[PDB]
């Protein structure tokens, strides 16, 4: 795979830095796989790192949502926690998802 | 207590109606005030009426804050968090209060 040819449709070439900044904005239908992404990268991190990360995750999903309408918001959120029940992915702690 | 005079501030003369009807607008210093009129109501009422009316508690809760801010809601809602811990209260089960 030295090839530098790809057509992948995931988040496996995505920095941090912008996996970050999608938080809260992903698509339902995409949700499990950028899941499974971002924990694949925290599990590699020094706990310094993956605190500051999560941080950022949390900062970014709050700024990308806060002018939402709670109706939208809602309608996501609940799409967000069906999609992970389906991916067999470990529950949503708060239902405000990643602002929290 | 037959005197009609009153100066109360508080639930206690507000219809059932009018009290589903403000449900997600009551601001967080009259929070615990409400949930006890509520339940005080609510443990008076055969199941059936109970049902309806926390169906409607719910209908009024997602009305009244479709269309606020996510920013404003989660200000409003961990502010209502707070203040029903500090009055002793049993937890709301869901952090989207009653919309859910
Ligand atoms: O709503 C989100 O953006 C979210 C919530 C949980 C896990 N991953 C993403
Ligand atoms: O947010 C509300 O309106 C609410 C939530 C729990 C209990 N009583 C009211």
Redesign the pocket.
Known sequence: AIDPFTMAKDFSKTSDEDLAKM????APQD?VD??KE?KKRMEKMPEDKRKAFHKQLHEY?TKNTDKMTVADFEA??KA?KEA?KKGN?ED?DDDF??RS
């Open positions: 938080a809260g904005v992903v949700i950028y899941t971002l999903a996501r959120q967000v992970l992915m949503m998802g990643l």
